[model samples]
Target chain A: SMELLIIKERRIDYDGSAIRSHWAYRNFGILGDSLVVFRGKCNVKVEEMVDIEDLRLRKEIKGDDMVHYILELFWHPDILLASSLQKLLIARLVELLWNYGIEASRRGDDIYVNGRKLSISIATVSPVSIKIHIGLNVKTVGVPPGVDAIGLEELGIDPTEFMERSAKALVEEIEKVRKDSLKVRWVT
Target chain B: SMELLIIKERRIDYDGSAIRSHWAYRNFGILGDSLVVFRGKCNVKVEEMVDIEDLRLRKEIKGDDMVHYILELFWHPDILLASSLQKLLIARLVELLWNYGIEASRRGDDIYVNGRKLSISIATVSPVSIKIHIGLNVKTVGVPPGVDAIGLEELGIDPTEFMERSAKALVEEIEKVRKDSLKVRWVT
Candidate 1:
């Protein structure tokens, strides 16, 4: 096996036609060439996240550092309630008021499960913190407006309020993972 | 894995600066809503190859009706050597020469024999036939001339020859694997 290096982590927000949420992406670099991407959970207690205002310069630091650093960003929970199951249920029922085949997935957690062709997902988990993050080594390209992309502005939610709500949701997901002990673990 | 389909296989012949020997390359492709490149393999068989001189084309295949295809292109083995071992071994050594400062590792049959920067690659295996054709997906956008780039006139060689050469090298490598049953898989 080759050397596996865990690089940096960034706290950011994403917005799209479907859902808007903040995420922490951890970029774990690989043996010196390619990058391995991990897209779930974050350890935010490590360091303060980069400022949303400073995000433009974040792209430059992306592929340039061989050094390692981590950051934590916060979000608000009020935003979460506005994008929850209750709202989704109402939205689907209303879509039927019009004449189209659009509906929320009554089946699973896939926000936009669209038969594997294309999926548009928008979710805001609440009442608990979602330690969601991403890990990858890549050159961060600029997000063109109206293009299919995620932008930093979406992640600019107040972390303190977001963390309180997320903490509740996380505790519940944790309970499920424990009953299905094969699922979760804490790593140092 | 979604669906598997095949559109064409094209053979490309080009001159390699290494020992002034021409290298025959075979690229395997699947054309669909978008062309998905499966893999690429260079011919190890330098001797006893015939040339098929024509530009081959195939089109408009839906996912359900796809099958493996073979195209014929012909060229001389630019890197003339007595055996496949000589060809691959020289390729291994040339790799070392190119990236002198890296950690290299050479296992008995496979050569990464010494370093952090080694690669093991092989094209897809099909029950249809081990003979694969090469297709050159040449793009000149940012490729340095003759480095990672190919010229227009020098592209496209007959795939039949490439298939025979790669298979020969593959068989040799497999034999090495069989003899060393105790080798580490290095999957991680």
Candidate 2:
């Protein structure tokens, strides 16, 4: 079983560094594989970022307020798997939003509402774990120019409730995928 | 007059970017020079960090829980004055902690309690302002090894009360200096 923590009240800013291994353990004392969600302003620094393309182009990931999910998986430390799982989580977010009557969609690795973007995400790994940090805009603030975005507040979804529900969706998705892997026989 | 906002309830993570011009204006709607105090965990990433020596040496400024002071001085924006006033703010903290019988001392630019460091501080300038970020540990958490430290919890002081009083002290100190400057005469 995986530990899940939805910090509905406290605001924990994401500076990119919090995406490392054992971050949940360090911040909330969850020693096993875990999903930690919190809300705050997001301004991921260049030094802590994982994407070489963004870094090479000096892209700034600045959000005035956001809902951040930090998910850690201990089974595999592969970037390919990590990236695929990251997109899977984003797709899960889109599916859940649709259930709420909101037409949120996924393009590449980000979530967008209408024509504006809604989330920022990355997937990478440490020696012991694969990690993902996803930031969904609650109220976009101070983003770089030429970037238009939509917030959850615009869609009338409270970040607190949405974050908790989102946490449940991702955790269950992972668990069922694990069960599926275990219950099925592989064609070798 | 400068604006004073004591964010007593919310947790605002300090990732170094918050130590810039108009941060208070953007974050809290304080459209003037302001002293904004809030509490949260601090882990200043290398890219957002400013201190050249610390950056060169790869020193980590890590605190699990802290009361942060973000002061914006939109006046001259001088680095010398900013650094001096940063130390002056440190002195104010020492005085305030002494009032609570904490016995905190200052060395160079840091505050200490019986030789264990108690705070991480920085002073830098932007084009339009001089910024200061002072993080006082309330509960010491994931600090680097070989670093001795003490927190306000151990000293039996409430972070809420201490933060309020510290903000008041710094603001008053700045206002009084402003008054002194206004009443002064030219050396010539």
Candidate 3:
């Protein structure tokens, strides 16, 4: 069996909000899957991105609009494995979106979560989005002791800057840990 | 063209904790091509059965335990629908099951709306399990103000008693709503 090596952590800063602004998920892939980790000790967060509060799209329209909602999930190559972890993450996130301070509601095709649309999108994908994105600088801050740098490297990651960058990825990943507010009417 | 008529409103009465129950829906066949309605009215209530609470099957069991939960859902017939309305009804009902009173949750299997398993078993046709049961009553409580008695035979009901019996049939329809529940940990 190949040893799991966790190497040094690294960070790469970019404007992920453009992924949504450009609506690239429709063509590129589910944002979270390509950018986040669903299992083990990795995560992803986006900054300055549209949240369910700011940019909302609920009533799924045909073609691009509907496709965009489906595309904005965590996209991982090993989807089956990622999918398993997503189930648990979504449950936590949905609860947070609703019972917590997050302002969550839904109307038509748009879902407003945490005062933004992107948050709701993340909540939606928590159940099945892939948790990996290439070129994404995820911060691997809390590296377990026994699982050494070797383990991190085996999974193809750097530890030094991982946490700082992972914290950035966490911006969106945290949304998946709370309850989802997909429809405004659904609240009342 | 037949005149529009108001038959009666449906009243649903059930225990607060019944599971997988939903509003009454019509299996109205195709339009003009299939048949035309001259006059027909039936009031129905999809009441919850108090005998049992929501049912569930543990999502993470192997061998026999897995079969009990997963296999049962896979074996139902009527629960599996082929038409659009039925499909919509199934979706709504499943949504109700997963997230009816509470909110969404997740498990090893599909993430549920409430706590119900997330599968398209009801959306497709297969071996079909008749486990999850439900009950409904469709009756002609009253006729139009001006009309005293009406004959559904004119509206395609085979016999005068057919519509009346259809209501009774709904009582047995409850059987189709069987669901799996989470494993309880009560001490003996």
Candidate 4:
């Protein structure tokens, strides 16, 4: 459906479970191919982390406050494809940041600005669908000790407007993907 | 003339001007080809900043406290070679950090651990020689607003021991280079 839903007000303290498939549908009536964004405090429990490295290393994934983007796409069981979508989102965000006179880049799924990490990302698959979560710091303080993160406020950009434009960009791209996939596999 | 000098028990606020050639000779008793390690507060002024991008964009280079490594190589006006040596130092430090179970990498002259910047480096040419400065965070607090930095304390490493081991490593490496260079340029 190319759903881009930004949940306004009532800040959710994201505890790593929000990345699950159908989270959007269950909570906010968002259907297939959804992008659900919200403002939140991030405190991802070690048990809920999807990355094996995080589990093994016992890494803390905490942020003071964030702009969270959760994705749910039904009928896709491919984790790599989900990862590709995550990469695309980073590229688009980097593009946006660049346009706003900031230097941002993606090293793998994470976004970096001038060598400092600016975003968090993870993609995983389930029996029902592919799920992804990306988080950006709204305030620079209280990130996990092992993490060096820059925030939206540090970059001097309006967080509300940034998320609004980002959601629209992702929705447009996903809509294009849907339209492109409908074309013939090979022209005769 | 491979000198790795760690100044004991002095807290110098390192402004950007510290990167100048002959800083070691003027300040310390170090003679030539020296690596002078010191603990300091870093607040590099824009006027003394060598990087043009920093000047044009006005990037602030600051740290609460750091283990600063200043290199002074005599009779070599090659900035690129000095850059290579800076790169080598980062490589060595990454190697050391890896031994301690911290995953670190060099993206250009800077050192990053788990996508966060862990070290700051700059190299420049002077008519006297090639001078360089690289700083690693000792305490994570009070870094420049734009910087995302992790510290030695966060990584669970003792700063003094870390500097000592690192100095020994660089000194040994430089000694080898001296002996090897004197042997032959190319075998007939």
Candidate 5:
């Protein structure tokens, strides 16, 4: 029999305002076949994880003088493990945006609120643990008349920097919970 | 040519507590040519609607340090139009519960936390609008160990009364929002 080495501590810097956020979960279930820990109740899964490493912003104009504000989140695969952790992270991201009157939703695997598709990607996947990279994208568009209300420029906000701050806060919170419940034991 | 009439005005007796509530939506999308208003983003359909009518609560058990509290919300078919409305209602409900230190989530068509499920339902459904009777159910079970932190009884609170107040406040807020966006128009 082989032994599994489970790490119990995670260190990440998170700095997002604490208004509305996802609930913290304390327990999880193990998927024997997949060898993964899943929280059946919330559909969260975990393995190795990574913190947010990049934030990207862009804009687009679709007819009607409407403007779009896009925010993207990037993660290093070596430090990222995908699952409902993404859901929790995204939920927090949307709540923060809403505080600024920006609305967003998640459909399929992307987050969008301004008629744009948010993107999330993993550079590669392997059965055996491998160094990797991934990203999460968020888009917010503003309709004309109210465009300034939702515009990043009018709001005097930097999308990349905002995301970096928000993502760090979220990842740190999730990591805190993860480390708390993480159990490291040697088995025969 | 046929002229369509849209009248929006609602008043309900709300004696619930003054905690947190949902943000009102200003406008909605109309189905092309149909003249029926809908929220395209969350696919909220509205033809006939009812306001909140009832709120219910109950409890259950699992094992040690694992108690369950269930909360169910029932809405009249007219009042309980699903989609973002439901989402808004549930979000407000959870927030209020959290204020009291209770956590819940929207899962499938219901809300659950830990291994417990929070059920919200409508007494009946129909095609033609009716004064329809609807009720919402919410259950909360407190497990031991950390039970002191979550037990409604321990907090010297009455579950039924508490929910009635919370649910009423939530419904009233939603109704207030509905009235604000309701445009009364007459066609010749």
Candidate 6:
């Protein structure tokens, strides 16, 4: 039997226009044997997301001694949006609106989700799993100290809880696309 | 378990100098699931391939309604020099000589092998398998009549037999490279 390598590029679009998301992968036949890399470039034209604003685009290459490559979006989520129901679809929807200006702003390399600025990073551990990292913020947003502060603690939100759910949802969406569409069609 | 996608790029070189060859793949991670596409730009500087001369480089886009893209090299090997022992390595050797001028040539829209114009096309079935097609040709090279003719019929060479051997050898070389090198490392 012979093994094949498939390459496909699917453009994610909202309202018939391409949005920001790129995914590349090499999948070996065995279980848990694969290499998946993804990067989401924030587009300012999206209107659904109100708080995001572009300050300046900067690029830098950083890594260990083995390899180093250019890093983008220092203060952005590696996995833009993850949900049980077509996370990419919703992500692009938000991206579309964010381009239109609703929620999310970029300042001095840090991106703000909602009103308060937060630090976050996503790491891919396996084919269908990811680990998300979120940190405490020094700055606060909204009306008052005791009232309108858009803090996660004040808003009763747990970062890890959302991160876990989002990560799992993303993998499901990817698998669905692979099984239902691309992977099953051309196997001869 | 999660699946990861790995991406790596290898540059093609002729006689220690880089030549142009592009390959992309998407493995669906299922049985018989993959899409492998390759495009190689024929270089006129290949001296070993003295018989091949460039008339004009033309491109065309072909394929089903789901996909369509430009095609290059109407009469050239997209990935030349595939072998069981480091297929790319052997491919590079012949490419190096082709760069140096020895056997093989091209004119109009036809390619000449062993001083004889022969119609041939190689199809990539998988990363490790290929199907070769050789057909009708109106031209023949070398000394004519009953003398120095390098024609397959005149030389007593079986076209399909040689094509099959060459195609299988190329695929075996590809498998060796995939297993020994790119697909193994950094898989977590």
Kindly report the docking quality category of candidate 2: incorrect
Per-model chain B TM-scores are 0.23, 0.97, 0.19, 0.92, 0.38, 0.28
lDDT of 5 by residue, B127-182 (tens): 32111111232213322232322334444445456544554544443443333222
TM-score to true structure, per model: 0.17, 0.50, 0.24, 0.49, 0.28, 0.28
Cα lDDT tens digits, model 4, B91-154, are 5576567568786655555778767888887766777777767799988887875657899999
Chain A agreement with the truth for model 2, given as TM-score: 0.97
Error of 3 at A69 (Å): 13
Candidate 6, superposed: residue stretches over 4 Å from native: A1-102, A106-111, A118-188, B1-157, B178-188
Q: Mark the regions of model 4 whose C-alpha exceeds 4 Å error after superposition.
A: B1-188
Candidate 1's C-alpha runs over 4 A off are A1-43, A46-188, B1-188
A33 Cα displacement, candidate 3 (Å): 8.9
Give lDDT tens digits, candidate 4, residues A35-140: 8888889998775777666667777888888999887877445443455455555655765675688867555457888688988877777777777788998887
lDDT of 1 by residue, A16-77 (tens): 11011212211231211111211222222112333233344432112211111111112233
| CAPRI quality band, candidate 3 | incorrect
Ranking by TM-score: 2, 4, 5, 6, 3, 1
Residue range B1-188, candidate 3, lDDT tens digits: 11111122332232222122111111222211011111122221223211111122211111100000101122223321111112222222322333223343322113343333322111122232122212211222332232122222222333324323332222222222211001111110
> What DockQ, between 0 and 1, does each candidate earn?
0.01, 0.01, 0.03, 0.01, 0.02, 0.03
